[PDB]
Amino acid sequence: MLCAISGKVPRRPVLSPKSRTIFEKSLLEQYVKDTGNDPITNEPLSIEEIVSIPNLLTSLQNEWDAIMLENFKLRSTLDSLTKKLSTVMYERDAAKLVAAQLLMEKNEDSKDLPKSSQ
Amino acid sequence: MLCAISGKVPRRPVLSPKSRTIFEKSLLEQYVKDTGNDPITNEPLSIEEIVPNLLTSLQNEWDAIMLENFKLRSTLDSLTKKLSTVMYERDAAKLVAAQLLMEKNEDSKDLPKSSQQ
Amino acid sequence: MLCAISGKVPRRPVLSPKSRTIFEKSLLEQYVKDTGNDPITNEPLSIEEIVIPNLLTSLQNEWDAIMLENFKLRSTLDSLTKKLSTV
Amino acid sequence: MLCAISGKVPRRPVLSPKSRTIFEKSLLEQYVKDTGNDPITNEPLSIEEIVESIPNLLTSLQNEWDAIMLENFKLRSTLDSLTKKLSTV
Amino acid sequence: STLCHHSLPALIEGQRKYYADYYAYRQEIRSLEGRRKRLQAMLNSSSSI
Amino acid sequence: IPDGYKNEIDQLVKKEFANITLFLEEYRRKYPRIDTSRYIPNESSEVSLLGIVDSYLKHQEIVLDTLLPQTVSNQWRINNDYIRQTCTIVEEMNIQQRKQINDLEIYRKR
16 A cells, blocks of 8 residues: 555555565656665565656645655654664673672572571 | 577568567578578468557656665654554553552651661 | 455455455355365466555656647648648 | 647557557547547547656756647647638638 | 544655654664573572571 | 673674765755745735735635535545555464464574
8 A cells, every 4th residue: 555665655556576565656667676675675676576836835845845844853863873872782781890790799698598407 | 689590680570470580681581481480489471461758757757766766765664663663662661660659658657667667 | 456356445465466456364264175276267366475756757748748749730731731732 | 659639659559450650559449439430531430449866856847847838838829829720821 | 624634644754654663672672682681690699508 | 691601602703803966965954844834824005916816716616615514424444444454464474474484483483
């Protein structure tokens, strides 16, 4: 029902035989010419393999506004994940060192109780 | 802008109505008189048989917009997905400390009350 | 929306990768079990084998229709022009 | 080089066999769907018969549609005037 | 619109992602043998005393 | 404790942390490029004739030919049916993910 590239509702949907996924013909035809392979699965795929007033002013203006502010805000979202994907891994490794430090602590405390009996 | 017999720039581009391919009037006529046939497909053919971009540019730039949004979204979900596995495993690993802490604390009270007596 | 074999609304649509058409899984599965083929094209198919732009295309319809509007006036002009040269 | 319907450079031109004339696939199909005929010769033809900055660019497309709308208008009022520049004769 | 938003929160934004959490739990299967194997050896030494 | 042990362990983890396109992106700053605000207003007394005919008559004729009804609601409700087929498919996947998610947790529980 949708294209698996742009996020459109295709006018001329075409499906690839390597990976069952429906793409709009212009967008899939572009990808093959760029690099001859299926975009999702990264499998060998070729082209043959596939199976006035408001409209000019108001509507077209809004479309290029919606594209501009969306990708800019999307670029901002991608930066935040890279910004602190780092805060996740650092806090993770910080926890690993605590477990490793406590692993020596606990068994040693528990072994001192076993020795205490003697 | 090329004939499909000699490969010259056709000054008088005539086409055969059996297989769509633009030849030149002189060469195709010489081929017909040789043998009544089309040179590409070898089908029957005779002499009598022979006889906006701004929107396209707007499409071409959009075609890139969709290709860019795809690769940007893939890294978005793929990278953020690693965020989820980390956050779950981090608080999971955090519970290791809470358990480890209380056990280490129990050993000390036990040993100190025992070593005392 | 429809299954090409039966003509019902398929409750489990699976598209084939030999002849691109949306078949109901339960229907097409029986068709494969009968003989390993796609029902439309009769090409070989197995069970594992089964699995802004709208605004721009609108502007093509606008210009493509208006271009024909010009021919109606170009062709009529060529007849009225000769209903004038001979007159 | 030019399709004899719109005036564009055809991106998928098709030629009519009744009359030697390279049309565009989209435009010729529309004409056949209206009435089964060739637009130049009016001969009985069918579909099977055929043988195959950026913000300033916004304002340019606005001006170009603005110009074509007038270029189409001026061409029809002239056609109507000749009818009586002929009916008066 | 409503359906789209719901799906986005529900399918893309949650249920698919939870699978990653499940995988994290899955590493789990392996920490347990390590947990028990330490306890089993710790029990063996207690038996000797 | 969903209020003590997490706060305690967080401080211990905290302590170990104490130890350790051109046109599109520019438009994002928050201004859409202006379009042709001309066709709507115009003026009978005012300047330019083309605006009357090179803006309003031909577009109004195209509008009146475009503004339609022949099909009417049939073309709209036909698309409404397609949207319902598109929607149910998503919720079926919501279920399939819901079952496998609970299924994995079920195995962990044992």
